[PDB]
Amino acid sequence: ALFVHRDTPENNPETPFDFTPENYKRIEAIVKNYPEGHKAAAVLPVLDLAQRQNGWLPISAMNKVAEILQVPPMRVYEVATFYTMYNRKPVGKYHIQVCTTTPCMLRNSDSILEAIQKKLGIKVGETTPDKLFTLIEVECLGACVNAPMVQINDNYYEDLTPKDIEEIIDELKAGKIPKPGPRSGRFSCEPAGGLTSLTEPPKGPGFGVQAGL
Amino acid sequence: SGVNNTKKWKMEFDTRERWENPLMGWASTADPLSNLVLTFSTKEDAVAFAEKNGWSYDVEERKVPKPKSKSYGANFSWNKRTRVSTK
Amino acid sequence: KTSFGSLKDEDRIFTNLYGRHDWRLKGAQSRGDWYKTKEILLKGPDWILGEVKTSGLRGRGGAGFPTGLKWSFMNKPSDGRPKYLVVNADEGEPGTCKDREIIRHDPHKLVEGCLVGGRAMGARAAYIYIRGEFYNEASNLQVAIREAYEAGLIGKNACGSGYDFDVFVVRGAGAYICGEETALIESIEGKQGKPRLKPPFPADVGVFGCPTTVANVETVAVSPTICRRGGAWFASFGRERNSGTKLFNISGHVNNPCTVEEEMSVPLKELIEKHAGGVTGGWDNLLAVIPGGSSTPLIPKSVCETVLMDFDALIQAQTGLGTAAVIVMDRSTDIVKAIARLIEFYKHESCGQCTPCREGVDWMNKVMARFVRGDARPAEIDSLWEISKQIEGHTICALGDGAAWPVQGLIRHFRPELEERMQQFAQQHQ
Amino acid sequence: FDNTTYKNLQHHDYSTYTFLDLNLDLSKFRMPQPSSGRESPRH
Amino acid sequence: SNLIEVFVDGQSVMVEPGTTVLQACEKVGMQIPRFCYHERLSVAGNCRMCLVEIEKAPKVVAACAMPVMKGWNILTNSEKTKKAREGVMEFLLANHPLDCPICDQGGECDLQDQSMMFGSDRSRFLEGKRAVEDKNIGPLVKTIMTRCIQCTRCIRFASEIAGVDDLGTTGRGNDMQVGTYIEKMFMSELSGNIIDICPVGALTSKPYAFTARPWETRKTESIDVMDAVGSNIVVSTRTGEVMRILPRMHEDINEEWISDKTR
Ligand SMILES: Cc1cc2nc3c(=O)[nH]c(=O)nc-3n(C[C@H](O)[C@H](O)[C@H](O)COP(=O)(O)O)c2cc1C
Ligand code: SF4
Numbered sequence A: 001a002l003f004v005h006r007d008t009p010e011n012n013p014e015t016p017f018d019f020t021p022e023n024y025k026r027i028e029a030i031v032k033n034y035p036e037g038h039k040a041a042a043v044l045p046v047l048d049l050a051q052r053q054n055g056w057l058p059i060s061a062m063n064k065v066a067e068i069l070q071v072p073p074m075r076v077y078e079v080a081t082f083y084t085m086y087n088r089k090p091v092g093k094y095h096i097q098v099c100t101t102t103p104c105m106l107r108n109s110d111s112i113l114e115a116i117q118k119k120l121g122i123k124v125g126e127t128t129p130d131k132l133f134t135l136i137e138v139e140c141l142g143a144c145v146n147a148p149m150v151q152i153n154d155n156y157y158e159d160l161t162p163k164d165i166e167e168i169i170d171e172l173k174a175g176k177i178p179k180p181g182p183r184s185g186r187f188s189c190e191p192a193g194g195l196t197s198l199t200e201p202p203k204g205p206g207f208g209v210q211a212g213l
Numbered sequence B: 001s002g003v004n005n006t007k008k009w010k011m012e013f014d015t016r017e018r019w020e021n022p023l024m025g026w027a028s029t030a031d032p033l034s035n036l037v038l039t040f041s042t043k044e045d046a047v048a049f050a051e052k053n054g055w056s057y058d059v060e061e062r063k064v065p066k067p068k069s070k071s072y073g074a075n076f077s078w079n080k081r082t083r084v085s086t087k
Numbered sequence C: 001k002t003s004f005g006s007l008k009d010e011d012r013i014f015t016n017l018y019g020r021h022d023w024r025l026k027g028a029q030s031r032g033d034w035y036k037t038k039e040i041l042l043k044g045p046d047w048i049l050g051e052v053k054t055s056g057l058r059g060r061g062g063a064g065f066p067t068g069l070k071w072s073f074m075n076k077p078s079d080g081r082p083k084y085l086v087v088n089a090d091e092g093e094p095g096t097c098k099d100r101e102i103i104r105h106d107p108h109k110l111v112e113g114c115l116v117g118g119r120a121m122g123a124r125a126a127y128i129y130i131r132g133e134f135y136n137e138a139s140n141l142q143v144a145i146r147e148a149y150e151a152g153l154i155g156k157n158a159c160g161s162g163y164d165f166d167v168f169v170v171r172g173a174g175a176y177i178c179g180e181e182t183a184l185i186e187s188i189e190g191k192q193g194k195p196r197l198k199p200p201f202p203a204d205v206g207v208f209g210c211p212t213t214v215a216n217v218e219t220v221a222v223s224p225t226i227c228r229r230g231g232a233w234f235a236s237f238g239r240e241r242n243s244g245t246k247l248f249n250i251s252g253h254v255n256n257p258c259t260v261e262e263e264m265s266v267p268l269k270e271l272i273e274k275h276a277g278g279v280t281g282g283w284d285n286l287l288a289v290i291p292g293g294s295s296t297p298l299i300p301k302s303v304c305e306t307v308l309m310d311f312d313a314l315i316q317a318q319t320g321l322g323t324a325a326v327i328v329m330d331r332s333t334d335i336v337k338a339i340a341r342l343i344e345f346y347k348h349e350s351c352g353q354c355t356p357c358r359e360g361v362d363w364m365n366k367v368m369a370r371f372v373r374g375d376a377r378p379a380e381i382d383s384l385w386e387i388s389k390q391i392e393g394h395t396i397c398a399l400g401d402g403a404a405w406p407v408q409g410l411i412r413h414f415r416p417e418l419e420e421r422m423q424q425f426a427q428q429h430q
Numbered sequence D: 001f002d003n004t005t006y007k008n009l010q011h012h013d014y015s016t017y018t019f020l021d022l023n024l025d026l027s028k029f030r031m032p033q034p035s036s037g038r039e040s041p042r043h
Numbered sequence E: 001s002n003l004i005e006v007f008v009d010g011q012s013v014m015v016e017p018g019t020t021v022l023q024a025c026e027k028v029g030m031q032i033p034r035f036c037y038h039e040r041l042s043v044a045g046n047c048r049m050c051l052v053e054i055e056k057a058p059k060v061v062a063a064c065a066m067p068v069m070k071g072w073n074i075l076t077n078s079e080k081t082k083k084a085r086e087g088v089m090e091f092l093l094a095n096h097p098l099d100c101p102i103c104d105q106g107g108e109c110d111l112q113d114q115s116m117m118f119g120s121d122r123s124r125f126l127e128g129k130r131a132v133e134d135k136n137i138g139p140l141v142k143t144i145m146t147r148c149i150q151c152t153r154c155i156r157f158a159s160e161i162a163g164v165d166d167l168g169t170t171g172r173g174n175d176m177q178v179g180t181y182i183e184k185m186f187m188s189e190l191s192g193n194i195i196d197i198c199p200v201g202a203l204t205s206k207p208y209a210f211t212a213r214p215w216e217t218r219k220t221e222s223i224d225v226m227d228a229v230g231s232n233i234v235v236s237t238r239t240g241e242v243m244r245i246l247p248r249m250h251e252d253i254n255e256e257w258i259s260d261k262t263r
């Protein structure tokens, strides 16, 4: 929650970090996507890759990224602290992120948050003692019509109810993987109880095409 | 950054000795002109005043900041070093 | 025409909106994607821009500037720098989730739009900036882009037209402000997502300091159809200067919250009842609607009775179409809390760059928290109104305006609710 | 013509590196990038 | 031949293309209020204190950044311009600490002086104020970063003039903080100049701390002898004792900077 770094025995410039050879080849691909002489544009993707390898970003991880791209270290510190998806502290194996913005709140996102905490016995912004779950509230995740919803790692679980979210957490504990997407009974964003549109088969190539082409 | 105290010409005299008062340590002086500062609209007015009163004077030409070339778009240059790395 | 709505399925542009057909290239082609792209490309930028201008299409990212005129700022000779198209897939406005469905179910429409839209501007490549939370959708788009590369539809000699075009996908890292067009550019360049002042304009100095056009996913994805079927076909839907179809998100207190394509200028009541299954508890239970994402001011039930869903109608009602995300609130809602949560959202999203939003939005957030409890005086309502007017129009980007407008809509239409909240608090503590 | 199934089930097998593996596979299709003429603005 | 005509409160002035609204006003003796802008740094445009009405334009423009178009009539004293200044000053002071008596900038503070001349005379902020922890960046510059107004002058000076990219902003929104993130000294032969350009008492001279007030110092214009550049300086004295050394502007020598040894 603090945006100043203080060296600790676990997070200091000597804390070991280095990209694996497989990730270095990925880095060479990221950098090649930008014009020559503008390598600093790869800071976000490469810094996000360091999180994917390591789970979070120690200061030594940010120092390596600055070194690779030849940017000043402070310019990588600015990016790390500006974007909310970068973890500057360790998070649990499953980062539970519950949307509580008004569209999700209107469909009772509090009950989802209350259910999770009761299940995991923690609070918003805490990690379980086993270090399997970290819980936080986030802003609109772009899945409002499927509210209430949560994101766990890269996956969305949508149309949740307190029973559904507890099912997802149970599977995560068990070691399995729950399929993402709505849990109400619809596949995605279509209205429940029957489509009001896109019921006729779509037209084929050339349909409706003006003349002169 | 205010420049409002750089509009007018001033006349002051050479600084002279100040010493510590034995009783309290205050700054004592024997210079009656130590605090005398005069204001003038132009250096010509100031030079005229100093000559009719018989004072030797030094005149220092007014320093005016030169015009700069400012471009906000220069912060984002495609191929020039003016490109900033942070905002 | 005098009434709008009831868009026939054969007139819908995003025909795989729900992902019940194959989203990969074979599915896309069978639905008409990538058909005669070569011929469109060889028509030339002037013809493409002509079709977009005549279609009357307006930007779908929230601001609604005429797309054809905006894309014409790029139709000028190269001065030695590359030219780029940036596709805004940040999809961050609360209540909005339309671009998510385009990206994951019709990715080849977006890719073809980038090529068609990129050709009209003379761009060498397209950067599709997508929010980092859309990992699965970004991966779907990455699969589609590979298929387009493998079929020869993008890259060298794209579609056989001899035009070279690359489509890059870059992911955000969690910032709503990065949906702003110039903060999006700063984010691509590996800086904090802080919007730039204008001038310069992106069409002059943009990504990497090069001519750039930032276009919303919906704006780009519909352009190939507008070229294939013509601007006149598109301009035939909706009111004058409010043309075309539109993706609507209906969330909140509705029976069937959903995404749906519908004609521009369809009545708000019709859209909710026909597609969303009506307001929860019936139309009489409606309290207020936010008709175009959280940045637009709310309108009460009386205005919602007959208001049309287009740019000009909603301005007439003291709001805006925005992204066409309809958040419905029924009478059980605590309207003051619902708005207070949106200000709290803008406090967490402000980039902090410029004084009126860095300080003003946090100020409005603190005042709105007390208004939720009634721990205030009625004289503070006019103070809060003036504070919002000080932020609005004095900031670098529109996020400041997007935080002031919700507050004004609440004070404008629900002042008695605010005052009665304060009266209750005073009575309890006396 | 089937309209009663979800045909976007591929993204249930995506993993941590799916996005950056595809970006690594696309690298051979790209055109040579433009150059500003210097290694960076600090050169 | 390239000059274009603009108007500053109806007064015609001829300016080169690219001249900003702020520079045009300066040609007729109007100094636009400013915080983030410095004529020797790159334009920032974030403080918003320079907003000014352009006649017939509904929206105010940041004068420090907006290039001036021919025929523009810049209204530096209109009601819209005045109210924009009052609103921005109100936001600047909302979280500013009540530190003037213990703050060394008092008496020579641009926030104080522009608040007197351009802002309102009272507060309507009824909430608690932000408080920020103090960073350590060496034995020369003391930081009380609760006073920082986030103008980024120090960031721009360090990167562009001193050539050191160790200062930046961390965090976002109201919690954005200027500093080094890590515990790092800003030890540069030009580092002391950030004291001068910081408009507030966020960065102050550690050796000078608490010793004097500006109104009581006598100013002696002199020259530096710590090197052969001959940097122009002001020797602030009080009651026959030297209190501090400040740069004196000379365009052909030191501009408005000095070395830390000189300072
Ligand atoms: C805070 C903020 C967030 C924005 N987010 C988005 C967004 O997520 N998607 C989008 O297309 N436009 C967004 N915009 C609007 C863009 O700045 C810009 O107007 C738009 O991308 C232009 O595309 P268009 O003309 O096709 O609509 C946002 C603007 C602001 C001020
Ligand atoms: S209005 Fe807010 S988000 Fe926009 S530039 Fe200013 S501080 Fe940043």
Ligand code: SF4
Pocket (backbone or CB within 6 Å): E096, E097, E098, E099, E100, E101, E103, E104, E105, E106, E107, E109, E110, E111, E112, E147, E199, E200, E201, E202
């Ligand atoms: S910086 Fe200026 S306004 Fe702020 S406490 Fe110091 S003297 Fe007062």
Ligand code: SF4
Pocket (backbone or CB within 6 Å): E147, E148, E149, E150, E151, E152, E153, E154, E155, E178, E197, E198, E199, E200, E202, E203
């Ligand atoms: S420390 Fe001073 S110069 Fe630096 S950003 Fe803050 S107020 Fe501006």
Ligand code: FES
Pocket (backbone or CB within 6 Å): A099, A100, A101, A102, A103, A104, A105, A139, A140, A141, A142, A143, A144, A147, A149, C094, C095, C096
């Ligand atoms: S409000 Fe929760 S996904 Fe949009």
Ligand code: FES
Pocket (backbone or CB within 6 Å): E033, E034, E035, E036, E037, E044, E045, E046, E047, E048, E049, E050, E051, E062, E063, E064, E065
């Ligand atoms: S002086 Fe222009 S915005 Fe700061």
Ligand SMILES: [K+]
Pocket (backbone or CB within 6 Å): E105, E194, E195, E196, E197, E198, E199, E200, E201, E202, E203, E204
């Ligand atoms: K200072």
